[PDB]
Amino acid sequence: MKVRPSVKPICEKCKVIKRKGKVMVICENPKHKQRQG
Amino acid sequence: MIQQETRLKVADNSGAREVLTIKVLGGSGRKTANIGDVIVCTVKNATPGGVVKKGDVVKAVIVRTKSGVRRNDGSYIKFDENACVIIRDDKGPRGTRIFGPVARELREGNFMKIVSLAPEVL
Amino acid sequence: SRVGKPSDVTVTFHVTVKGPKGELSRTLNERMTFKIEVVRPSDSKEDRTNHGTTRALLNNMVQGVSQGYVKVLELVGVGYRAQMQGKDLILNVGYSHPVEIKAEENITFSVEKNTVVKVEGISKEQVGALASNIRSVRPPEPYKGKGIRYQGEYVRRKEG
Amino acid sequence: TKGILGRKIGMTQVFGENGELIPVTVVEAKENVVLQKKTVEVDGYNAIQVGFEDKKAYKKDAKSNKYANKPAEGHAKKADAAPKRFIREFRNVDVDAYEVGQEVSVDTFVAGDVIDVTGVSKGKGFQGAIKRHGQSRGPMSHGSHFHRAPGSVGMASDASRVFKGQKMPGRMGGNTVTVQNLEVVQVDTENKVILVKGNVPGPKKGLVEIRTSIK
RNA sequence: GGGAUAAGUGCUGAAAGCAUCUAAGCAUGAAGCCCCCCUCAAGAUGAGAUUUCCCAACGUUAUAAGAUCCCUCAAAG
RNA sequence: UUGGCACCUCGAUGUCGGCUCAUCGCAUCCUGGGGCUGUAGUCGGUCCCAAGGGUUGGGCUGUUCGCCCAUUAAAGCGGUACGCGAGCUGGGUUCAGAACGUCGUGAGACAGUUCGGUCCCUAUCCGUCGUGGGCGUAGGAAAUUUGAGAGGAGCUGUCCUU
RNA sequence: AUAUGUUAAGUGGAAAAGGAUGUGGCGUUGCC
Numbered sequence: 174m175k176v177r178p179s180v181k182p183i184c185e186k187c188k189v190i191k192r193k194g195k196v197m198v199i200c201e202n203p204k205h206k207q208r209q210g
Numbered sequence: 211m212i213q214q215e216t217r218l219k220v221a222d223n224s225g226a227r228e229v230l231t232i233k234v235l236g237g238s239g240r241k242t243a244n245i246g247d248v249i250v251c252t253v254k255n256a257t258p259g260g261v262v263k264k265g266d267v268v269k270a271v272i273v274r275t276k277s278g279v280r281r282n283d284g285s286y287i288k289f290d291e292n293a294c295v296i297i298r299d300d301k302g303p304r305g306t307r308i309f310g311p312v313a314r315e316l317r318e319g320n321f322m323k324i325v326s327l328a329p330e331v332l
Numbered sequence: 333s334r335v336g337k338p339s340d341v342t343v344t345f346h347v348t349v350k351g352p353k354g355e356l357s358r359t360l361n362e363r364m365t366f367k368i369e370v371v372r373p374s375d376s377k378e379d380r381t382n383h384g385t386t387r388a389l390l391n392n393m394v395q396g397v398s399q400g401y402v403k404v405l406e407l408v409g410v411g412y413r414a415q416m417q418g419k420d421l422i423l424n425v426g427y428s429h430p431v432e433i434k435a436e437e438n439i440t441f442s443v444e445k446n447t448v449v450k451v452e453g454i455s456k457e458q459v460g461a462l463a464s465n466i467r468s469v470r471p472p473e474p475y476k477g478k479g480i481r482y483q484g485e486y487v488r489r490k491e492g
Numbered sequence: 493t494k495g496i497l498g499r500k501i502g503m504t505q506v507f508g509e510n511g512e513l514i515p516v517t518v519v520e521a522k523e524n525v526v527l528q529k530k531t532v533e534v535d536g537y538n539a540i541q542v543g544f545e546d547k548k549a550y551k552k553d554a555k556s557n558k559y560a561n562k563p564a565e566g567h568a569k570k571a572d573a574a575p576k577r578f579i580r581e582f583r584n585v586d587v588d589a590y591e592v593g594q595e596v597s598v599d600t601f602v603a604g605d606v607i608d609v610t611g612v613s614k615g616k617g618f619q620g621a622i623k624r625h626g627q628s629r630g631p632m633s634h635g636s637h638f639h640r641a642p643g644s645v646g647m648a649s650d651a652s653r654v655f656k657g658q659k660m661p662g663r664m665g666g667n668t669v670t671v672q673n674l675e676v677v678q679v680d681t682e683n684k685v686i687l688v689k690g691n692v693p694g695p696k697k698g699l700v701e702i703r704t705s706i707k
Numbered sequence: 708g709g710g711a712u713a714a715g716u717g718c719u720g721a722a723a724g725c726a727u728c729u730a731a732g733c734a735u736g737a738a739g740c741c742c743c744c745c746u747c748a749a750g751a752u753g754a755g756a757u758u759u760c761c762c763a764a765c766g767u768u769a770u771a772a773g774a775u776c777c778c779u780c781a782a783a784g
Numbered sequence: 785u786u787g788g789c790a791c792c793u794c795g796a797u798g799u800c801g802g803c804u805c806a807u808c809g810c811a812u813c814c815u816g817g818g819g820c821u822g823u824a825g826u827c828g829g830u831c832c833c834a835a836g837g838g839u840u841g842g843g844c845u846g847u848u849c850g851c852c853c854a855u856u857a858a859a860g861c862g863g864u865a866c867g868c869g870a871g872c873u874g875g876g877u878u879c880a881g882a883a884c885g886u887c888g889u890g891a892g893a894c895a896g897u898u899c900g901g902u903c904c905c906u907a908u909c910c911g912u913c914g915u916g917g918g919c920g921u922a923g924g925a926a927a928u929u930u931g932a933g934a935g936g937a938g939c940u941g942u943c944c945u946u
Numbered sequence: 947a948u949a950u951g952u953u954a955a956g957u958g959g960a961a962a963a964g965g966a967u968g969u970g971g972c973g974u975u976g977c978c
């Protein structure tokens with residue numbers, strides 16, 4: 174998990190979602206898992 | 211009842227004669243050590259030709275104390291002096307002989323070589 | 333909703349089926365009527381979202397009452413075993429203690445070779461939860477694949 | 493569970509199996525009687541009231557607690573027992589296994605039973621922070637004028653006050669204390685004595701309450 | 708040890724035909740939160756409960772149950 | 785923190801370090817939970833949650849700091865008048881003596897140094913720790929109690945077995 | 947209180963670069 178103010182897709186498979194009022198990026202690549210914070 | 215700066219006779223032939231206690235091992239804030247406990251010490255007095263020399267920082271196991279120890283049967287044993295034995299990491303004595311009586315609690319401490327070499331185990 | 337817009341089962345509306353493989357009742361959203369077929373009132377955002385999810389839940393109820401659901405887990409690794417201790421499952425997955433997963437109502441366990449476990453039930457959510465717990469007992473590890481994985485799930489493998 | 497009242501007699505020792513020395517406290521628990529049964533329906537909770545150490549009957553012009561007053565005498569007669577010196581409630585036990593007026597014998601406990609013992613610790617009067625709170629002394633030499641004082645009691649302008657709970661001199665001891673997970677060493681039906689491993693609160697002759705251990 | 712949670716992990720699931728831990732639902736998950744353990748506690752003026760004891764006449768006098776004064780004391784001070 | 789400003793205090797708001805006693809924050813040192821890893825394992829790196837508890841004994845120096853010795857699960861960083869002198873000390877620092885270097889014609893002086901050098905106060909109020917008396921609690925009284933609420937406690941090592 | 951709409955953050959009831967399928971209103975265009 175990368176916790177960062179700037180969350181954005183890192184490849185074409187990254188998907189931007191919103192969970193519990195937080196902007197996240199989920200991906201097949203676990204390294205690309207991101208949460209805003 | 212051995213604490214920092216307590217001086218101890220050495221009850222072996224490793225070269226050290228008197229040591230000064232640097233630290234009582236076995237946890238933060240530990241103040242006192244007794245028979246079977248391990249101390250870090252410095253050799254203040256040595257005999258010529260010994261393996262252990264004056265100024266060395268070594269580890270020793272306490273083998274008799276003036277405070278003595280209490281056994282579960284309500285009996286006690288006390289000695290006339292505080293004496294220790296210089297040891298290696300393997301708990302084996304650095305010297306090849308042990309002088310004077312040692313307490314039987316060393317056996318529970320697993321200092322079996324020291325117990326074997328002691329002339330009397332009480 | 334494109335998702336939002338039966339058989340001899342009851343479908344007797346809250347809903348409560350009486351199909352072959354059990355009843356499987358629930359409540360469903362309280363602002364959506366049915367004629368079956370659900371209908372979306374007021375066309376709002378929440379209305380459309382709830383219409384879609386209610387239709388999905390109803391289809392799931394029908395499928396489970398008719399032909400049930402089955403999730404399959406496989407254990408990978410030398411010595412890994414899954415026994416059926418009566419009704420419950422017992423897992424030997426490399427721990428110092430066997431793991432006891434207790435069976436539940438409208439849910440049945442099966443084991444093949446004491447390696448491939450199967451969970452069967454009327455309720456899709458309950459079957460999924462049971463399978464997820466059996467997986468969570470010891471999930472797959474990326475270096476050798478050892479663990480209780482889903483039968484048709486891809487495992488990402490890393491080198492040494 | 494189980495409960496009894498007694499007087500602390502004193503400390504002694506015994507030799508256990510394999511000869512180990514077991515320090516023990518002798519408790520004399522004679523004359524224990526169930527005086528009342530409190531229930532949820534009437535009292536709102538389940539408990540048994542136990543009286544201990546019979547006292548003298550009521551007499552006119554009694555001047556001390558040695559003689560029962562009329563309220564206490566009526567309370568005891570309702571149980572058909574002599575008036576008792578000490579009365580305590582036990583909530584841990586099961587009230588359906590006792591009758592009003594029945595004796596609670598030392599044979600209630602058995603050797604090896606794990607118990608909690610409650611009692612009033614020994615009083616010590618007015619004591620300072622060194623003994624009462626176990627604080628450090630100041631230096632005893634090197635010009636020091638600070639030996640057994642409690643030290644600083646707060647901070648500066650913030651907060652301009654001493655906080656509640658500051659440790660200061662005051663009366664020490666005489667507090668209810670429960671020692672947990674002691675063991676019953678021996679029960680002696682004659683002499684009505686229980687031997688408790690270890691030591692318990694209070695002076696000799698002080699009242700102690702023995703209960704089955706909560707943990 | 709019990710309950711509820713954090714970061715997490717999910718199941719079912721639409722908006723968005725798919726995907727998605729979430730939007731509605733359903734789980735799980737910390738030495739931490741609330742209890743569990745110990746002590747004080749009804750001036751808790753919201754002043755609670757139980758058992759037992761006592762019962763008068765003309766503010767006054769004498770009293771009940773019950774306390775004290777005074778005296779011998781210590782486990783208390 | 786070093787500063788900038790000069791708004792409270794010059795009919796006085798005692799300055800550094802230490803001792804005693806703490807208390808709070810979390811940007812967490814340890815312990816608990818978790819994601820990623822260029823995570824094989826044992827170890828690590830990094831980020832997230834988490835303030836319950838814990839978090840050392842010496843050599844040198846007035847020291848704070850820092851270095852070192854030996855430990856420890858760990859030896860966290862900060863706030864509280866750089867917490868705390870009507871609680872203590874008084875080594876240092878604004879005092880009278882004296883000396884060195886240096887500057888000054890001199891009296892004397894110091895990005896300096898050196899030896900010596902008086903620490904007052906019987907607690908009124910609030911606050912805090914204990915301990916009594918009065919009245920109230922719709923009769924009076926003895927004993928046993930419920931628990932609204934409050935306080936306490938909360939750490940962790942090593943070894944064997946698997 | 948009245949009418950119309952916006953917000954779901956207790957935003958309202960203290961802040962930035964920057965990040966984001968949060969949600970309302972104008973639109974310009976590509977495909978059908």
Ligand SMILES: CC[C@H]1OC(=O)[C@@](C)(F)C(=O)[C@H](C)[C@@H](O[C@@H]2O[C@H](C)C[C@H](N(C)C)[C@H]2O)[C@](C)(OC)C[C@@H](C)C(=O)[C@H](C)[C@H]2N(CCCCn3cc(-c4cccc(N)c4)nn3)C(=O)O[C@]12C
Binds near residue numbers: 796798903904
């Ligand atoms: C020991 C008693 C003296 O206290 C002190 O000396 C101290 C320890 F209390 C002291 O020094 C206080 C603390 C001083 O006050 C500080 O002054 C600073 C400038 C400021 C500070 N604050 C405001 C920041 C003030 O608190 C000062 C000036 O005293 C000199 C206070 C003033 C009011 C003052 O002069 C008073 C009157 C001072 N004094 C002159 C002593 C003069 C010196 N002396 C004489 C004697 C003596 C005489 C006769 C016989 C014997 N055996 C001894 N002992 N000591 C006395 O005769 O008595 C006291 C109270």
Ligand SMILES: [K+]
Binds near residue numbers: 749754921
């Ligand atoms: K009351």
Ligand SMILES: [Mg+2]
Binds near residue numbers: 179
């Ligand atoms: Mg970036």
Ligand SMILES: [Mg+2]
Binds near residue numbers: 629
């Ligand atoms: Mg000290």
Ligand SMILES: [Mg+2]
Binds near residue numbers: 632636637639
């Ligand atoms: Mg003195």
Ligand SMILES: [Mg+2]
């Ligand atoms: Mg400033």
Ligand SMILES: [Mg+2]
């Ligand atoms: Mg100006």
Ligand SMILES: [Mg+2]
Binds near residue numbers: 793794
């Ligand atoms: Mg001034």
Ligand SMILES: [Mg+2]
């Ligand atoms: Mg003034």
Ligand SMILES: [Mg+2]
């Ligand atoms: Mg944090």
Ligand SMILES: [Mg+2]
């Ligand atoms: Mg020296």
Ligand SMILES: [Mg+2]
């Ligand atoms: Mg200060």
Ligand SMILES: [Mg+2]
């Ligand atoms: Mg002060």
Ligand SMILES: [Mg+2]
């Ligand atoms: Mg001069």
Ligand SMILES: [Mg+2]
């Ligand atoms: Mg000159």
Ligand SMILES: [Mg+2]
């Ligand atoms: Mg001198």
